[PDB]
Amino acid sequence: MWELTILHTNDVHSRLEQTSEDSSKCVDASRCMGGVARLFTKVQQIRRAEPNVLLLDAGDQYQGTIWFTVYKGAEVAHFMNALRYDAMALGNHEFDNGVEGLIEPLLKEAKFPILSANIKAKGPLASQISGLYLPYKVLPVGDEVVGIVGYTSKETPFLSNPGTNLVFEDEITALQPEVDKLKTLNVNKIIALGHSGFEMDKLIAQKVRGVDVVVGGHSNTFLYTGNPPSKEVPAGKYPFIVTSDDGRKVPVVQAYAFGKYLGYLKIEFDERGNVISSHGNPILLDSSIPEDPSIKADINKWRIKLDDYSTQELGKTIVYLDGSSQSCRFRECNMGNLICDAMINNNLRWNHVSMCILNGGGIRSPIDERNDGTITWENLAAVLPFGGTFDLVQLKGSTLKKAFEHSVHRYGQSTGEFLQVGGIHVVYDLSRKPGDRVVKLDVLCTKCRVPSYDPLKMDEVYKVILPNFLANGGDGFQMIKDELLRHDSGDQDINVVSTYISKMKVIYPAVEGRIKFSL
Amino acid sequence: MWELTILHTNDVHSRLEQTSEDSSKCVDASRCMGGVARLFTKVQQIRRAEPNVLLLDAGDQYQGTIWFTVYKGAEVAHFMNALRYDAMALGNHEFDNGVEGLIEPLLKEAKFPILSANIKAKGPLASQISGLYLPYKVLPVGDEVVGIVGYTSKETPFLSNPGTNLVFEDEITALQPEVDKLKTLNVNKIIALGHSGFEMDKLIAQKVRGVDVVVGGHSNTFLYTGNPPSKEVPAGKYPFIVTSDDGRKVPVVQAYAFGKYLGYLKIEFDERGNVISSHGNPILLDSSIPEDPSIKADINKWRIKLDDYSTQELGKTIVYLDGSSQSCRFRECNMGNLICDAMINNNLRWNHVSMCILNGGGIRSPIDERNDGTITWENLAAVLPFGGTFDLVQLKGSTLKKAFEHSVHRYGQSTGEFLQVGGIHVVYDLSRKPGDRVVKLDVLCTKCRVPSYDPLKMDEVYKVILPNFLANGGDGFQMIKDELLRHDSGDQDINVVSTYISKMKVIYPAVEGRIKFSL
Ligand SMILES: NNc1nc(N)c2ncn([C@@H]3O[C@H](COP(=O)(O)CP(=O)(O)O)[C@@H](O)[C@H]3O)c2n1
Ligand SMILES: NNc1nc(N)c2ncn([C@@H]3O[C@H](COP(=O)(O)CP(=O)(O)O)[C@@H](O)[C@H]3O)c2n1
Ligand SMILES: [Ca+2]
Ligand SMILES: [Ca+2]
Ligand SMILES: [Zn+2]
Ligand SMILES: [Zn+2]
Ligand SMILES: [Zn+2]
Ligand SMILES: [Zn+2]
């Protein structure tokens, strides 16, 4: 029998340095986690112990901290080469700086295959990008050969900036002919490595004949067998077993996000490449694992240029700024209220925009207050990494009512469309059918001398400050894009929040009942 | 028969210049009201028409605008002498700058008798103040004589700063022997002129034998017969008829506040000084009455020194700052929220005071936004004229619960104890018995990383920022004074709100459900 050890990361999102338990900037070094130096140490311990090891990445290395803001993907190629990744699948955030932002710093510099079977290039781009990413790779592992086939979310055009020249096909339709090709070349051990979310990973495991293992990302899924080591609640056992249509038990794995864990799956194969069994668990990369000094020294060398974004203190917080997805995609989070209050305050400088809506998935990180409360550009850069704008927009009450129904239409799945608000008091009843969950919606009046809250009226018009991402129909808010009456472009997102914090000096945004649930 | 015309003012509170309909600074001159130049014109028109006229003041000329801040009562003696007041009764605000603040600028400079029968001086003060105010005066009016007897609120020691050396006796007990003295001197026409509120004015009319008329103040009572000319809703007919214990019909009058109206009561007496009948109404001092140019010119001469408090713009408001008593003593008013937000913001500069309570009677004026939104020291001086401080205090939840029960214990009478809040969400049910009207009370947690609202606990302790007036048991909040665990003195009230506004630049405080009523 032949044993393979798959080590996998996903949704690392520029967490090159070690971080806090909430994946924000490391303050108390004794309880810090993750980061590529610590990962390098654990990978090395496994490569010493196990003869057949593959180190895989399921996408979204791009976007998340000042590392990516400054180095634009060169830190990813440099530190993934130093860690000796065997393969990587393209994620949606790999296209955030267009195709050239992917081609030049990463595709042309990676010393490992970068994969995606369902991305087809067309027109002039097709010639330049040929061979820079591959539909699959066959990798020698000891005396055997392992096929790895890539896949990328079909939603990348709606989430990122891949351009017109790239077509994202259905993953199952694009994967089957590649897996069939590998089987004709007698590759009997096949890993599907990709970035489409756990639900799609489960469908690929079921529908794509010949796939032995699925290693995914995108949904930040935490899977565990037994008692979990930190705050992440497991969504299922590790590995997650799917029984395929042809009757094979297919393990599906994912390792949360931000380099906090290293996925570890041991697979026992027979001579014909059949999975006899498999077992493992994500390894928490906590303080007990030492950071490799060679990688840490090289990180400290690259950190010098980034220290210009931490020397200038913008303001000070006396509260934890909860920008976690567990809060911001499920309920009112004070990071949401802060950003919506900065949005309204920057604009109100004799203009009358009283209302704000902000997608929870746009808040990419919390900020900690225990470093004497100090907030820097570096801290803000991880909360608002996209370089978007906060736009003024004019909407009918009916349109706003539909947006709030979309905010909770499939609540409970940690999706980014949950809205954080300002100048709005919304009440939900999740017991009701999707599309009819908003039980109360009051808005701060504008055509009144003393502003107060009153029921929203379907026939009335309202001025709303919101990200350009929402104004352009992002996160399924097509009603905002289709039904809006006016859309003006506003100032840069990070500059708006920064200018607000420096004026306030000390901030203490609270959760105050802007969003409520009715039992 | 002999006819007397009584013209009366009360609670003018330094409104020497004409003002807006809400009694705040005049912006649109074409719709402005009151002010002493306009009053002088209407008084003159009546003195030309009627041979027997008395111009009376029932107290509280002191405190209210930059006029009093700067001239400290010299403007009151100067402009009351110029208007030719026949008599004035002492109010509680006449003692705001102590006994010397009353003696020197007003008592020693008034060319008319100043009255109070129930104020008895003791110790060294008794010698200095002898003859400076009188228990009564007998005034010649044509061929007849009219006795005027003064009275001042027994609550002046709890509201103002009269010192230890002055005793405020029960008005009824002090008035009867003075009215009896006037009757032995054969003065058959007696006016009780004083400053104790409409309820006490009604009791004096009933219980003090020999009083023909009561002219009051303090409660800002608006009385009218017929269709009223402005926003003030009448509390009864003008005059208000009380039937005394000895069976006489006694008219009781009051003329709202701030010099917006001139009280006008015509009384028909027989030869034995019996009131045969009476009639009249408060005259609205609106734009249609011209300001007397001699008084206006003299006001413009005195206004030069006060223009140093209007040249410096503190900030800008884009909302009406509702500091009216009709809002601030009955429900959440945004002037209250603004002041409580300045109170918390000034203090939070690693201190953790999340809560604020502010008596509604401490907000002495609104601010208008139609002068391009500009806010000046002059505008703030009329909102916060006392020169008090916003103190930090430590209270048991039980104590805070009792203070909120006191806030609405006799709701509906426009009393100053209604509390404006910050970092507190209170719900009242007025249907319940007094002392049991608070149905919900949530407070912003402090021993938590993310502040949120949670039910107040009786056994827990809380840090609260509030005026020194409240910390010292003012407005019947004896439980705060008796039961507090710690009381530190804070910064000056007006400087705290000013420093806040200049930092914010544009303010837009809203009514947001901090205070609610349950049906
Ligand atoms: N607010 N701007 C904004 N701009 C973008 N370019 C953008 N791309 C993704 N998002 C948000 O991020 C959410 C997806 O986050 P995750 O579930 O963690 C998958 P991801 O790692 O972003 O590919 C979406 O639901 C959106 O709310 C984005 N939000
Ligand atoms: N907040 N400070 C403060 N300091 C003072 N020195 C003071 N004196 C009076 N008040 C408030 O003013 C209210 C009385 O106002 P009115 O009913 O208009 C009678 P007034 O003209 O003040 O004598 C009281 O209930 C208090 O709330 C006062 N409030
Ligand atoms: Ca196989
Ligand atoms: Ca009489
Ligand atoms: Zn991701
Ligand atoms: Zn993704
Ligand atoms: Zn008064
Ligand atoms: Zn008074």
A100: Cα separation from own chain's centroid = 21
Q: CA–CA distance from A399 to each of A396, A406, A477, B344 (Å)?
A: 5, 11, 10, 37
Separation CA B353–CA B446 (nearest Å)? 7
Separation CA A227–CA A234 (nearest Å)? 9
Q: Does A513 touch chain B (CB under 8 A)?
A: yes
Give me the residue label for tokens 């002493």. B36
A218 belongs to an annotated ligand binding site: yes
Give me the residue label for tokens 């009824």. B172
Which ranges of B145-259 does DSSP label H, i.e. alpha helix? Answer: 156-159, 171-184, 198-207
- B374-376 sheet: strands from edge to edge: B374-376, B313-317, B506-507
Residue of A nearest to B327 (CA): A450
CB contact set of A447 (below 8 Å; sequence gap of 6+): none
Q: Does A272 touch chain B (CB under 8 A)?
A: no
If contacts are CB pairs under 8 Å, which of residues 340-379 in chain B contact chain A? Answer: 348-350, 352, 354, 369, 373
B351: Cα separation from own chain's centroid = 35
Contacts of A506 in chain B (CB under 8 A): 348-349
Separation CA B415–CA B427 (nearest Å)? 19
The answer to whether the bond into B177 is cis (omega within 30° of 0) is no
- Residue B258 corresponds to which tokens in the numbers above? 């701030």
Contacts of B504 in chain A (CB under 8 A): 503
Separation CA B107–CA A132 (nearest Å)? 96
Q: Does B512 touch chain A (CB under 8 A)?
A: yes
Amino acid making up residue A432:
R
Contact B75, B65 (CB under 8 A): no
Amino acid making up residue B14:
S
- Residue B406 corresponds to which tokens in the numbers above? 């006191």
- Kindly state if the Cβ of A216 falls inside 6 Å of ligand 1: no
Give me the residue label for tokens 């002898």. B130
Amino acid making up residue A321:
L
Separation CA A375–CA A366 (nearest Å)? 11
- Kindly state if the Cβ of B92 falls inside 6 Å of ligand 2: yes
Separation CA A219–CA B302 (nearest Å)? 73
If contacts are CB pairs under 8 Å, which of residues 290-319 in chain B contact chain A? Answer: 318-319
- Residue A442 corresponds to which tokens in the numbers above? 């009051």
Q: At the fourth CATH level, which superfamily is domain B1-312?
A: Metallo-dependent phosphatases (3.60.21.10)
- Residue A489 corresponds to which tokens in the numbers above? 């472009």
Q: Quote the ligand 1 centre to A70 CA distance (angstroms).
A: 20
First to last CA, chain A: 56
Q: Does A503 touch chain B (CB under 8 A)?
A: yes
Beta bridge partners of A194: A151
B113: Cα separation from own chain's centroid = 22
Separation CA B202–CA A13 (nearest Å)? 77
Contact B491, A431 (CB under 8 A): no
Give me the residue label for tokens 């069994």. A277
Q: Does A324 touch chain B (CB under 8 A)?
A: no
Put simply, the answer to whether B513 touches A425 (Cβ < 8 Å) is yes
CB-count exposure of residue A41 (10 Å: 0-12, 13-18, 19+): middle
Separation CA A80–CA A43 (nearest Å)? 12
Output the CA torsion A160→A161→A163→A168 (10° steps): -10
Contacts of A444 in chain B (CB under 8 A): 510, 512
Buried b / exposed e along A273-289 (16+ C-beta atoms within 10 A): bebeebebbbbbbbeeb
Beta bridge partners of B488: B392
Give me the residue label for tokens 């008035």. B175
* Dihedral sign from CA coordinates of A511, A513, A515, A518: positive
* Dihedral sign from CA coordinates of B90, B96, B102, B106: negative
Contact B214, B177 (CB under 8 A): no
Mutation target among A352, A450, A516 for the B interface, most CBs of B within 10 A = A450
CA-closest candidate to residue B363, choices B198, B497, B517:
B497
Contacts of B423 in chain A (CB under 8 A): 510
CA-closest candidate to residue A138, choices A127, A150, A128:
A150
Put simply, the answer to whether B318 touches A348 (Cβ < 8 Å) is yes
Separation CA A384–CA A68 (nearest Å)? 12
Q: What is the 3-state secondary structure (H, E, C) of A468-512?
A: HHHHCCHHHCHHHHHHCCEEEEEEEHHHHHHHHHHHHCEECCCCC
- Kindly state if the Cβ of B361 falls inside 6 Å of ligand 2: yes
Put simply, the answer to whether B348 touches A506 (Cβ < 8 Å) is yes
CA-closest candidate to residue B469, choices B94, B163, B151, B96:
B96
Length of chain B: 519
Q: What is the DSSP letter of B287?
A: T
Backbone phi, psi, residue A251, to 5°: -70, 135
Helix axes A293-306, A74-83, angle to 10 degrees: 170
Put simply, the answer to whether A452 touches B510 (Cβ < 8 Å) is yes
Residue B472: nearest ligand to its CA?
A: 2
Put simply, the answer to whether B451 touches A425 (Cβ < 8 Å) is no
Report helix, strand or coil for B346.
Answer: helix
Separation CA B28–CA B244 (nearest Å)? 46
Amino acid making up residue B339:
I
Is domain B313-519 classified as CATH 1.10.10.10? no
Q: Does A447 touch chain B (CB under 8 A)?
A: no
Separation CA B69–CA B381 (nearest Å)? 8
Q: Where are the domains of chain A?
A: 1-312, 313-519
Output the CA torsion A179→A182→A183→A184 (10° steps): 130
| For the CA of B13, the nearest atom of ligand 2 | 21
B337 to chain A nearest CA, in Å?
A: 12
